[PDB]
Model the fold of this input.
Amino acid sequence: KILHRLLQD
Amino acid sequence: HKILHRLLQD
Amino acid sequence: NSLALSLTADQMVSALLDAEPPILYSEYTRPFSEASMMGLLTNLADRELVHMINWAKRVPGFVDLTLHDQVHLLECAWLEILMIGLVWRSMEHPGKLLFAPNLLLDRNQGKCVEGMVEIFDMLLATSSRFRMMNLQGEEFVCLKSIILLNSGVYTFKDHIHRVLDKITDTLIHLMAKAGLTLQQQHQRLAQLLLILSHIRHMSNKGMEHLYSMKCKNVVPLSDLLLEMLDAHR
Amino acid sequence: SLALSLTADQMVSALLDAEPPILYSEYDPTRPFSEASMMGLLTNLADRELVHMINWAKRVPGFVDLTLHDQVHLLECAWLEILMIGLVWRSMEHPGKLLFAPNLLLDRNQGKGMVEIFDMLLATSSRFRMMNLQGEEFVCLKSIILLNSGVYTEEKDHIHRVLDKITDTLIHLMAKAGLTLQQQHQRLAQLLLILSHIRHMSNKGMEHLYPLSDLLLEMLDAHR
Ligand SMILES: O=S(=O)([C@@H]1C[C@@H]2O[C@H]1C(c1ccc(O)cc1)=C2c1ccc(O)cc1)N(CC(F)(F)F)c1ccccc1
Done:
């Protein structure tokens, strides 16, 4: 999930 | 109209 | 002017308690199929609706609305009201949903239909939340009336909001009486009202499933249920 | 750790500082409007707002204390609600209009199954206006949605304690504005009940959708 990456710096 | 009307008046 | 406003807190509580509908029984069984599942629930919900309408007319402030506004509120709120009722009487049966005294169900049964399990679990979490909060009957009937008045009022005036205010006052009065501090009072008030958001969500998801069930002919649904349903399309 | 040690004023400061910017749309007021273009513009906007929303969420007290799996779930559950309450807030001073962006101010007419949702958003904006919702209250409400919306679907306890702190903050804000105790509790209830119409709007929105960026599709996923 892109959301999951964006949540990581 | 609707049953609901009948039920609300009665 | 409305008589509802002039009621004291205890009078409001006593009125709401006295207005409570009865706990109905389903047909007299398991195991279950999708058709027989929806058959019992539809039959039961239909009879519950007739009592809900007579209950709603006894909620202080409701009689003061026009017939059209009464219709609108009940059309918007009815599944929410059936659900909070279900959750309330399921409290004492952790892990179960007490649809009727003779129809107590768990998740496994929820497989029965399509989408029932997800709603099932949401209903169970709500029930558990009510139990862990030790929700009192007096609080419960305040919450249920709030749902009736609130749920449709943004889709229409000030009368409804003053009555809602009166019920807020009544919830706080109940909590003060139970010994809660000022901070505990506001905190609990917020917690209870936020759960109403989740009850709205369950009803929304529930309602689109009842729509699809109309849109198979899975089961016969009454004219009354159809027109309650159609108000949400 | 520190979310439960903040004073109410610190909580308000934290939330206000975390506020995302107001983004512009690509509306070109010459272009004839398609149905497809209007949705194109809104999708483009929402997608960019999502990036700021994700980074705003990290700054909501308590949110980074949650596991990453839980952060994802909350944002998946709440993103449309959060976009919607932002829209309603910036639309407050524009009766009968929705300020999607400073350069994109639409009325019901330009809606149109979007008209139905637009009407509800307008009503919500009308309600905030009537209540004279304050910025400090708004940022509390928006943080509540984030924490609340997915919470019911052992670490649940941390979220509820943070929710309690935000309630304390709302109450603090109202006592400072001179409201009696009765008034505080009434207004508190009034604001929270709105969150339930808002949940309603978000769900009806999803329903009506059934032209989308990769991020939107991944989050639009979590409601089916
Ligand atoms: O809820 S909707 O109206 C939605 C709400 C409002 O208008 C639609 C919309 C929107 C959002 C995302 C998008 O890709 C397109 C449209 C809105 C929006 C609100 C605040 C913002 O800051 C940015 C955008 N919707 C669902 C959504 F958002 F998922 F697209 C929708 C779409 C098509 C038809 C009917 C409803």
In short: Helices of chain D lie at 8-17, 35-57, 68-90, 114-131, 135-149, 156-176, 181-209, 214-220. Chain D touches chain A at residues 51, 54-55, 57-58, 68, 71-72, 75-76, 214-215, 218-219 (CB under 8 Å).
